[PDB]
Amino acid sequence: SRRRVVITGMGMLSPLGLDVPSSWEGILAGRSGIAPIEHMDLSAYSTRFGGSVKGFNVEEYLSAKEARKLDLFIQYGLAASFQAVRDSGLEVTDANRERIGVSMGSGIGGLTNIENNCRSLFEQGPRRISPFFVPGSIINMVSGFLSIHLGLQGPNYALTTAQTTGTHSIGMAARNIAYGEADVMVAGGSEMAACGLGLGGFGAARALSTRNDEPTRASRPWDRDRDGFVLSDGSGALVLEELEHARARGARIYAELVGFGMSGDAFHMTAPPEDGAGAARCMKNALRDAGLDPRQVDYINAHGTSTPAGDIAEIAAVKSVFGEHAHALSMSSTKSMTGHLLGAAGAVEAIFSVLALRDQVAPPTINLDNPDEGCDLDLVAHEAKPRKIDVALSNSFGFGGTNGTLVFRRFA
Amino acid sequence: SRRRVVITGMGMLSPLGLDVPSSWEGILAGRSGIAPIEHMDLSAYSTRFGGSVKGFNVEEYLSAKEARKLDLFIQYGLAASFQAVRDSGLEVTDANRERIGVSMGSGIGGLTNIENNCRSLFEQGPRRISPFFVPGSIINMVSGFLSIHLGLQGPNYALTTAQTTGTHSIGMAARNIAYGEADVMVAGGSEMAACGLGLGGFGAARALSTRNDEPTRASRPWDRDRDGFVLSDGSGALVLEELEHARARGARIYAELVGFGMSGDAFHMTAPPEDGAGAARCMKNALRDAGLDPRQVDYINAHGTSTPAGDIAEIAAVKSVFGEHAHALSMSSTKSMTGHLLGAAGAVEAIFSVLALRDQVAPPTINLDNPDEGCDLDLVAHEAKPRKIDVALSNSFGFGGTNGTLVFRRFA
Numbered sequence: 001s002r003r004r005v006v007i008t009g010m011g012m013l014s015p016l017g018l019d020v021p022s023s024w025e026g027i028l029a030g031r032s033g034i035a036p037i038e039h040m041d042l043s044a045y046s047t048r049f050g051g052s053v054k055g056f057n058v059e060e061y062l063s064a065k066e067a068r069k070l071d072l073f074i075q076y077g078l079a080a081s082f083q084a085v086r087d088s089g090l091e092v093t094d095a096n097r098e099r100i101g102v103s104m105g106s107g108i109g110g111l112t113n114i115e116n117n118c119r120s121l122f123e124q125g126p127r128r129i130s131p132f133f134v135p136g137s138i139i140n141m142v143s144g145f146l147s148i149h150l151g152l153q154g155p156n157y158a159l160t161t162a163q164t165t166g167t168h169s170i171g172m173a174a175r176n177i178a179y180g181e182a183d184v185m186v187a188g189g190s191e192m193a194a195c196g197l198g199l200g201g202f203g204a205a206r207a208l209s210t211r212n213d214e215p216t217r218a219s220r221p222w223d224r225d226r227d228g229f230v231l232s233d234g235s236g237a238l239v240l241e242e243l244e245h246a247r248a249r250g251a252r253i254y255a256e257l258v259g260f261g262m263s264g265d266a267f268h269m270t271a272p273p274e275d276g277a278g279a280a281r282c283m284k285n286a287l288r289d290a291g292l293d294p295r296q297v298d299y300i301n302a303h304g305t306s307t308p309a310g311d312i313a314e315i316a317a318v319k320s321v322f323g324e325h326a327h328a329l330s331m332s333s334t335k336s337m338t339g340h341l342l343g344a345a346g347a348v349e350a351i352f353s354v355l356a357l358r359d360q361v362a363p364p365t366i367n368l369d370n371p372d373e374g375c376d377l378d379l380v381a382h383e384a385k386p387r388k389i390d391v392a393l394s395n396s397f398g399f400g401g402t403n404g405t406l407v408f409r410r411f412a
Numbered sequence: 413s414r415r416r417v418v419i420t421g422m423g424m425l426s427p428l429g430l431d432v433p434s435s436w437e438g439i440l441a442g443r444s445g446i447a448p449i450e451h452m453d454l455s456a457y458s459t460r461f462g463g464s465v466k467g468f469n470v471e472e473y474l475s476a477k478e479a480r481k482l483d484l485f486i487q488y489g490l491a492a493s494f495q496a497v498r499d500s501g502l503e504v505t506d507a508n509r510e511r512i513g514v515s516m517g518s519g520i521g522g523l524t525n526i527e528n529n530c531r532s533l534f535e536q537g538p539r540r541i542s543p544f545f546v547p548g549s550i551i552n553m554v555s556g557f558l559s560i561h562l563g564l565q566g567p568n569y570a571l572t573t574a575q576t577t578g579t580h581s582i583g584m585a586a587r588n589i590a591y592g593e594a595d596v597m598v599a600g601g602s603e604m605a606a607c608g609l610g611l612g613g614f615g616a617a618r619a620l621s622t623r624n625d626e627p628t629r630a631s632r633p634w635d636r637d638r639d640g641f642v643l644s645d646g647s648g649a650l651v652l653e654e655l656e657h658a659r660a661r662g663a664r665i666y667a668e669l670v671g672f673g674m675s676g677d678a679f680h681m682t683a684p685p686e687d688g689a690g691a692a693r694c695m696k697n698a699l700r701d702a703g704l705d706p707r708q709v710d711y712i713n714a715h716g717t718s719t720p721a722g723d724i725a726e727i728a729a730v731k732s733v734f735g736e737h738a739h740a741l742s743m744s745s746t747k748s749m750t751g752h753l754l755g756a757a758g759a760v761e762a763i764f765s766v767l768a769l770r771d772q773v774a775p776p777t778i779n780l781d782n783p784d785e786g787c788d789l790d791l792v793a794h795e796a797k798p799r800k801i802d803v804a805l806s807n808s809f810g811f812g813g814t815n816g817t818l819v820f821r822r823f824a
């Protein structure tokens with residue numbers, strides 16, 4: 001019968017820092033991680049900025065010989081996973097290695113690697129494709145390489161549900177533990193889609209902000225002057241652990257994972273419905289899963305992508321789920337600062353939701369100068385808001401009408 | 413406790429046929445779907461052959477306009493999904509649509525689309541990238557498009573576990589139903605990596621058979637002259653359904669899904685351990701999950717990829733799990749006929765395992781002319797073997813050492 005699940009370790013690469021504490025410091029101070037991109041020439045592109053990981057040292061984690069074979073999304077996912085496992089204090093042994101698995105996902109996976117190899121194929125021939133093209137690029141290899149390095153023999157898989165990937169990864173990893181399939185899971189997501197095909201492809205869809213002359217102001221969730229999401233890179237990983245297992249080893253517990261919801265919109269390949277119907281269904285599933293009165297919700301880490309249709313759909317969904325309580329909770333988009341880490345968005349935002357509970361503070365939505373028509377909730381404009389948070393909710397929505405909600409609460 | 417899960421609908425594209433009964437007829441006749449790849453200059457490639465889907469008409473499923481937006485792997489996934497839902501007789505209603513979900517996956521995703529958009533990017537620059545590049549290429553769009561087309565509002569997700577994808581997709585969908593998160597799931601996988609990038613990428617790892625003179629003899633699992641796997645395209649979809657739900661509407665039940673196992677080798681990025689310790693743990697996990705003794709197993713649809721190390725690991729694993737019953741069960745690799753559909757392998761092989769149960773026949777391992785050292789099990793060499801089958805296993809063992817086992821039982 002269903003076991004309880006707690007968070008005992010967290011790990012992160014973001015545009016704000018090379019770990020959790022440095023990233024969280026940036027979040028609470030309202031710092032933007034968004035800047036013109038330096039790693040390639042974007043003069044032919046309509047968007048020339050994003051949230052890069054700055055100064056990542058893969059040789060803090062891996063030998064240069066191994067790193068060379070791996071797409072940045074795998075390097076970022078391993079770095080976050082390694083941080084999370086170290087932060088947990090868990091020791092892997094013959095007695096427990098079969099009970100520890102990994103679910104680290106990605107929206108797009110090794111697009112940089114696949115692009116670079118496609119150039120080799122077309123300009124030279126197939127004889128120049130890397131022998132490591134497949135194991136260095138495909139999405140399941142974060143789970144793969146983490147298991148090989150740490151000796152994790154538990155369930156080993158990867159989700160790819162576009163911008164919902166990190167939330168689904170964490171939710172389904174909790175269900176694995178809930179139902180007895182594992183006692184520990186490393187779960188989250190990683191993304192590095194900032195190559196020609198990534199920026200070009202989202203550019204071709206006209207989905208990205210084109211505010212090239214003021215990149216730190218581009219991501220402006222619920223602001224009347226928003227013009228699309230900002231593309232960002234990195235990873236989040238959490239160690240999820242059955243409660244009694246955590247208790248038994250004297251683990252430091254950050255918070256409890258009490259609720260998970262999924263729903264499909266069944267609306268459109270890329271557009272969310274204006275009324276937020278799929279997002280509302282998803283949050284209701286998650287609150288019922290957690291056995292909660294909606295009035296118990298103190299903080300919501302919104303998806304909050306800075307798209308016209310996305311941002312307003314979320315207001316409508318929250319008002320529909322929470323009624324008059326929609327005016328008492330705080331909702332913010334940390335994407336105001338980090339940008340949109342795509343498959344890794346739900347993973348970093350799950351971590352920000354747990355740290356909101358530890359520190360009793362709602363992160364700000366920076367750049368919220370002129371809230372749009374109907375965006376009249378407490379969106380924590382400009383500045384972090386100290387406040388009582390017993391229950392925090394993290395939402396993600398993605399292409400294919402895919403929706404995820406995680407519910408965390410303080411643990412005593 | 414747990415709800416029982418049955419199979420009420422199946423759908424398939426394979427190198428043997430454009431549906432289940434045509435594919436199954438080839439399987440039982442020992443026919444090969446392997447041939448030189450057409451309409452593609454493979455001169456500079458060390459492998460020039462594979463399992464292509466022959467004569468697929470996407471306009472039986474989609475408008476020309478919706479098909480132009482979707483990678484071949486997505487088209488193939490939708491075809492199998494559409495066939496499976498039609499085959500089940502299920503009627504979607506406002507009363508049940510929230511209880512019907514989708515988990516269709518892929519190992520490698522949109523390589524053909526990535527290839528064609530790379531051409532545009534390198535030749536002409538980013539402004540020639542298709543607007544539908546991203547939503548038309550990402551792995552969760554089979555689940556996305558299917559959910560939108562049928563108004564499915566249940567769990568909506570996609571797995572990507574390389575060559576294990578279809579097995580994990582079906583297993584985790586069965587878990588969704590068993591634990592009451594859904595009453596119906598469409599589950600399986602799809603793949604089209606007979607592009608330059610798939611042939612080139614696997615070719616550079618020297619993972620492929622280079623038997624270009626005799627493509628139909630290339631795939632020869634457990635044969636001493638095997639020299640790697642054969643790359644193949646297509647899709648498998650099952651309709652999974654809670655038993656009381658299937659009985660209430662008078663559904664035709666093909667078989668029961670009684671067992672799902674997962675494990676990680678935690679050994680190597682592309683090669684299994686020689687003794688197949690991970691595959692043995694996974695099969696044991698699947699039998700424990702089904703409450704069955706290894707002795708009750710009658711038929712195993714092997715992973716059986718025709719790699720030197722893969723085939724021998726699976727013999728070791730079976731001898732380890734099954735002991736004095738290891739010779740009494742029948743084990744075959746339908747990859748002898750279909751080649752290796754990567755993420756769709758576990759989906760089409762689940763369908764073949766269900767059909768082995770319906771028709772009481774073990775499909776052949778064709779090309780098994782000279783069993784290798786220690787390959788002395790009943791591998792059903794050359795020809796289909798009618799026999800008693802109450803319990804059938806389907807194994808998938810993929811890159812990153814990720815393992816999946818499904819256990820099906822006759823339903824009456």
Ligand SMILES: COC(=O)C1CCN(C(=O)NC(C)(C)C)CC1
Pocket residue numbers: 493494495497498561562
């Ligand atoms: C136009 O709206 C509909 O809902 C129709 C769409 C077409 N059709 C199907 O695709 N049925 C399958 C999936 C069983 C093949 C029936 C339902």
